[PDB]
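Dear Dr. L.,

I hope this message finds you well. Following up on our conversation about the binding site, I have prepared a predicted three-dimensional model of the protein together with protoporphyrin IX containing FE. For your records, I am including the exact sequence and ligand specification that went into the calculation, followed by the structure tokens. Please feel free to forward this to your student if that is useful.
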Amino acid sequence: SRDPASDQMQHWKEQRAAQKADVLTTGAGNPVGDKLNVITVGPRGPLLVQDVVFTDEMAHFDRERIPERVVHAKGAGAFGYFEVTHDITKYSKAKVFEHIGKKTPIAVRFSTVAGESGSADTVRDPRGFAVKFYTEDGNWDLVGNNTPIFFIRDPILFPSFIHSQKRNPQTHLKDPDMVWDFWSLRPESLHQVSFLFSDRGIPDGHRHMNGYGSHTFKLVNANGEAVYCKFHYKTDQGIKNLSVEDAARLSQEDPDYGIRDLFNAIATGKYPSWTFYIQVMTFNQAETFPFNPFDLTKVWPHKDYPLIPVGKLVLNRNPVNYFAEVEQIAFDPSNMPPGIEASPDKMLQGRLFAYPDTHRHRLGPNYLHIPVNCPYRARVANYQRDGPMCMQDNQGGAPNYYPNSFGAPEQQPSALEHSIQYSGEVRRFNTANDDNVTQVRAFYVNVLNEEQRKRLCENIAGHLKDAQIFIQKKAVKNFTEVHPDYGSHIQALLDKYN
Amino acid sequence: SRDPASDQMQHWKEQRAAQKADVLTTGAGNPVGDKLNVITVGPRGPLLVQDVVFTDEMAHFDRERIPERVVHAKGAGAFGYFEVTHDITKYSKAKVFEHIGKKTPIAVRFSTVAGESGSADTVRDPRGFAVKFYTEDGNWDLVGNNTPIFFIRDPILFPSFIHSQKRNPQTHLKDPDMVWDFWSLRPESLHQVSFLFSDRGIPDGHRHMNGYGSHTFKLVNANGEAVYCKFHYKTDQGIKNLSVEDAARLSQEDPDYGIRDLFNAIATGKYPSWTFYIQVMTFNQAETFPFNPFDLTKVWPHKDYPLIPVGKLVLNRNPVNYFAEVEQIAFDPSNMPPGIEASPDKMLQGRLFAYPDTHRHRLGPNYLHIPVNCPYRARVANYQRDGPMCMQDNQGGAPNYYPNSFGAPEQQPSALEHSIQYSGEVRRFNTANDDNVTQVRAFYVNVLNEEQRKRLCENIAGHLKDAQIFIQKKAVKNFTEVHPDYGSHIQALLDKYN
Amino acid sequence: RDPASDQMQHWKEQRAAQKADVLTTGAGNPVGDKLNVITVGPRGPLLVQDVVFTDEMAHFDRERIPERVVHAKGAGAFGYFEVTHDITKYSKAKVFEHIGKKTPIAVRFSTVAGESGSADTVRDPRGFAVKFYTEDGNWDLVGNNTPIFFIRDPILFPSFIHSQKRNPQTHLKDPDMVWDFWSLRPESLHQVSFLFSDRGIPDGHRHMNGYGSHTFKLVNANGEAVYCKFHYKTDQGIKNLSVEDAARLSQEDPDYGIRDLFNAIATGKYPSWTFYIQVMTFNQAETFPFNPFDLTKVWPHKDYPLIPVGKLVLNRNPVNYFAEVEQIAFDPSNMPPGIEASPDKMLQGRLFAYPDTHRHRLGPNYLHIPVNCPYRARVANYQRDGPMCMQDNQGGAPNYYPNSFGAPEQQPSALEHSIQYSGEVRRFNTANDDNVTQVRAFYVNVLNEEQRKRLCENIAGHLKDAQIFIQKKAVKNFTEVHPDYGSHIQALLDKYN
Amino acid sequence: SRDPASDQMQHWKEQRAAQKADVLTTGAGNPVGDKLNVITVGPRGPLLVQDVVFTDEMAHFDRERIPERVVHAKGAGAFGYFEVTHDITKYSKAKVFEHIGKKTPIAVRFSTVAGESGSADTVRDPRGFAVKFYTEDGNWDLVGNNTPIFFIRDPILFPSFIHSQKRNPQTHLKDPDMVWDFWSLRPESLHQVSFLFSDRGIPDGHRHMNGYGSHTFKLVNANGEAVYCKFHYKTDQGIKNLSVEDAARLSQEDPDYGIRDLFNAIATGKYPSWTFYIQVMTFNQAETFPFNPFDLTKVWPHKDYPLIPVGKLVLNRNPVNYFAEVEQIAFDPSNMPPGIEASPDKMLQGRLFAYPDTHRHRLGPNYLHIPVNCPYRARVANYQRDGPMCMQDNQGGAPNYYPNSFGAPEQQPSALEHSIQYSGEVRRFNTANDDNVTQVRAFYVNVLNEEQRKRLCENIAGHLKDAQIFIQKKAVKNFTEVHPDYGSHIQALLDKYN
Ligand code: HEM
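The resulting structure of the complex is given below.
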């Protein structure tokens, strides 16, 4: 017998040893006599409409596909739990943190970003690391990435950015001109691009990478005080990356390497886990931070903002039905329980709207009714009703209007969001020149070593070489601004390729 | 205090007297601090995207509506059961009738035909009387009307007919020219038209009308022997209609009369019931039938095909949430368990396709998952998977292909459909010219007395008068063919109106 | 008979000599016979080979789309807008750029609660949405036949609507729901008073006024901004329907409004409205006795006189109601340079809702629908794909911005007007803002003895079916408006009970 | 400069060198002032709903995706024309064949089968070769493959088959057990499986493979005489295949190799073309045929049924916008003009419903309104109306019902389908046991040479080795029935891999 993943059916069959097989039926529960032949008028006669068994089955088959996630299409999933290991109640009143030892069920989905559903796992691309906490105060979705930062600092460019990362609207081909025209034109990307083209650009499976909330968030405590925070979840399996050669080879031998790896890890009991930490920055600290504490292209230096342990994330359960538990899963950053709130980070602010929006499309108006999306650890009650595919009792006959003198659900004052005062004009503040290099310099010079700097360049050049000369120069100019050697080294490599 | 219906909220409140109101939450189950004021910058400042509570509720509100039924849009719903009173196992083997005293849960929806959701109940129009039986062999939908016949005998004319019965494509107004041009051009309608324009055209509520399967179906017993049949469910509350005047008055005073009546009736304990009967024609009789036994414009004279008592239909339960239980309910005539099958009635044949098709549209691909539509008294097991809003376990990790050697669901021979021999050309056989007057003549002369015949002509005249003269002439020519008196009486009336 | 009734006859005549076109499937395949399906033998079963059938049936099975969540019942027409006065000092919007300038428009009138098959002549406010196809993109002025509204915060809308519609269980209209809500939210008094007055049931769409209702902002070439109110008065005059008549018409002709408008236009009696605006400077807004952005308040014409701008003329009926009316979509957010929103919470909420609901009711690419596309402007951006992409998807143009390949460029002059606000970012309760003053002035001055009487009996007529306690809560609110208002009402309730 | 494909944007640019860039607008046509920054209160404040520019663009981005084709998701498209070169009007009256020299615009889409959108092109899997002829009598969709046969012969087994070719429902991976269990259990597949694992299993791009309608169709002439036929379109570029190694390499170096190849060829004037042929069989021959002429697992021996030249298929136009022209395109086998009809081939009979059914799903009710699918060379006139995204004048105020006395479209008597006499029971006849080996043996023995047989076996064993031994045994037994050397060779190889 092979790996647990390939023995799926066998095991399933074996689990129903002394069991009689179920009667094959139509979607309406009507028993089927022969689902192996269609109804024709005579052996060599035409098909009949009366064959509803056929139609019923075919019609469903003709409808099993839904739109894939506009981004992070390709992915994997697992379930497990979150466990509180440390007291951070002085920062957040969130029930999910209330007591050390408290466990909250979680659902996770790892994923690449650019490729569609049939693309490979072992390719350079950041990785999605979404977490769904089913808490008593509703679901908390920490839709993070394997990176603490991102390519841009303003939501309105995301569509374009994604467009540049995807296929040429006409040829339907990946287009390095698109990729680098955008990147060279928008140097804020410089930070994430460096991360991207480094060794961590292609993690060895999902268990060997870190997770981050990336954006700065706000934590409010029982007394109502509030501080800003960052979420970090380090792999307990340790960071491990794939060499470009192996990544390339595997992308050929097993496009689903990531899915397979995870399933077998859990299937054999090697349950992966991550240690959950947070970074805290008081309003006063934020005021004097050397950068914009909400700029997604920046990080909070550990030296200045030490990691504060919070708990453990553990995945011990594989999905039973991928489509139902993984494909259909939906995470909304806007899903925050009392104690956790949003920060003025423009990128975040954007995602606040986008996620429920896209879900209403990809999945449907009542996507939250879907089992894996349902906040089963909370009592959903409100004045919302109906909608396509209303799968529950639709809250029965409870009064559907607020306020009302008939005892329908009431709002609880203690759940009010924290309020801060802001000043200045209401307009479009440009942020294209918000220091696009400083931290990148620190990364290149202080974080990486010679060996790694070499590879990073080789990686950037290997792809960049296919872009037009003028783009190459533009890109290189920005790289030179990060550090002279960074740009020069790349250029040299380009010279050879060209 | 008032009618049970009007006291709806009051009761709900009373039933929950001793308990505390639920906590108002968003869709993701997050508690809400204030759902009465949105978030703004300062008292008179703009709105924030951060106010997801707002967006969450609005977004759902924005999506409450689903496509109303393409026909029979306005209706009422209720629940109860069907009880077998007589043994007809010698004709059918369907579990629904397996033994006297057996009870099967039922769902029923009454409706008009042409009008849209906000139309009145008390208007001349046939009435929908659909029943859903939750059988062990899956669901059985007996989608019937309050008439044993219909206006046309070929499905391909249905869309047209319906169009002629709805609004003018440009003015969006009802159009007597459209209605009568079709009817006058298509005389098969004479029969039903006559029935529609009689006192039965406006039933006093849904409790005082009969129900019919209309089409000729086929029953199969345990020996494999089959026969054709008709279904009839006579009102035990007795036939009762509304006068033209009262209906007109009611349409204005209470457009929802039927809904109110039914709800209250049940709410007060006066559960309505119908005696279920069947007619039976052997294959031999089918050969000697003076007309086409599968012609939806023909009836089986009670004289030669006596009604056979089978059981009772009982509605003892009001819906709890209209949208979820009535609006979303779907009936498919194709849903027939072993022991009950379709006949070659072209109309029925067409219906075998239409319903599940249209349901996949207004409700959705997995419309059968919806609670009210689920065949909860049977275990649904097959090789159908995925699809939008797949609210279930999607049958987990079970093998998804048939055949398979891993224990998945199996076809059951006993459930094989009965088969009839057929020979001939595969083409479009015209039926426009089948008998369109004989049975109509019987109805006019015999089923109706002088008072009724008078009213019928007035009703027709009252409406036909607004059609152009040529149309009037054509239409009068048809009636005259049924009977000189019929044609003349109408013309006499038309002359006066003109 | 009337033009409407002759719709088909005229179509037939319009061709006259012409033979009929060939009947084809959706794929354009000619149909041999569309009156009989394919069976095996005269009395045999139906074949799947009959695709002509399936083709037609399948489409029929999908004819419907969700009716508008509200204002489902309506009527439409088209025409134009003509500038007659120069207000370029207040707005640089191209629609007003010059006296005599004509811009095509699209209008849809509607009721509110009732669904698609409900009657026209019922008490309810009336939607008066206008779509301007300008060179600077479409401008949707989504108005009502009233200057005010029942609430001042958006988060209460879904709730209000619910109360106005059917009970969730019985599916019936519930006066308890209606009044419990109103009685609990007295800010509704103003509009409620308007609703139960003679204007409650206009005599058709041609005899009522149109209002932008909300406070908006105009911006001129110099970058100077002012607040405004859009008003469009019927040139056919205000004409209402007595309850008795409305009732009868609701039975006799549930579509009286649709027929009336159609026949009017079909017979050359093109209806028109005179477009006006009220203006308030930023400083005036500082001293206004109430929140100038409160949707339950009006700007006294006495302190803010109407300034004529142009005319609104409807002279073209729809050719296909579905395609041209049912599918039409108005987005309050559709405002060209020169016209912007004000901080009116309600409006702010609508900015979001309409396009949102539209993607649901019509689809992602609902702007590609003929009646909905800005045909007077050239759409060029980085938006691509999505369901039913009916244009050319902007061909092979670079789909990312910025780009070095000549794709569309933003134009600075289009930047919105920037104001500087302050205060904490939170939910500021507004339930206690003045809820009576203007209402009292409506009852005392806008109305006369007869109107007040009717108003009271109309309210009583409906309010009497609600539970006594709600009746009490309601009357109390009315009494705060005016003692006689409350007293007259209660007296009537007393007889009813 | 590089390959035309990669110079996409630059050429687009240059073609507009002589004109100012268009004004960036909202979807509503409202000019945008700054689409690079969102509106916020202050430099570090939250996002406002007022920013409709952001929402507008974002909302659409959120809806870019639609469901990918349930099968043949990965594909490439091109446009060109069909030109008649010989006369077959004695066989068919179809307008597309009426005269030599007649050209007809065509749309074509190539594809794989099992893989999803982000999958590699150069893989072992059949190839879709669909053609759409925009004819005066409407569109004609000849939805063929690069093979004259298929794995199964009955429609109802299709979903299963596909399911077995795709991912495991739980693990979401490819499953050789699923793949081979089905095939081994259904020996009908032998023939097509043999083709699949032959050298033509991986053609060198789309230009070096053939195309066939596979199904037996029916042709009717101007005299009403009918015959049966097959459609073959041989590549004028010649058969050229890729070795496993290469396909493996390319699938990594360039997953879209197919797309690129096709694009560049057309872009550089090397327009690919195919010679269109037909085989004919008379009704009398249909009776003397050794097998069921309508059996999709059977071919018509060239010797007995010679190829008859008809015309040429030429492709000279690349898509301008892939999504709008390729992703959205739709082919319906049921789209057949007078002169061309369906045969009693079950598989075909099934496809007759599936295609337009699945299109109403992945595209929409009005999917025929999409330009590329619109039958622009014909005048669409009927009684159909409304429906989501009705992008037309909806046939204006024309009478929507048939028949009518108002001059609306009329049916054309000369468009009636040719009728055939049939006789038999309306039932499910089994076909699993028709001949599953003879024609397969011929291919192995007479068509293939030694080294070709060798490779064939190596490819089969190379995949099958990962299935459960018992599956291997059944499979081998099947291959042995075809020929001893076939099974023995494969077993020999299996023994080594194990
Ligand atoms: C009864 C068996 C079959 C069924 C039910 C079936 C069903 C389907 C479905 C549902 C699609 C996707 C349609 C879409 O999303 O546009 C499809 C596509 C396709 N099938 Fe079939 N198929 C069957 C047999 C075949 C056969 C035998 C052929 C070739 C002769 C064929 C060739 C293709 C091709 C070429 C496509 C892709 C069309 C495109 O490029 O858009 N199919 N099939």
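In brief: Residues 1-65 of chain A form a domain with the Cytochrome C Oxidase; Chain J fold (CATH 4.10.91.20).

With kind regards,
A. P.
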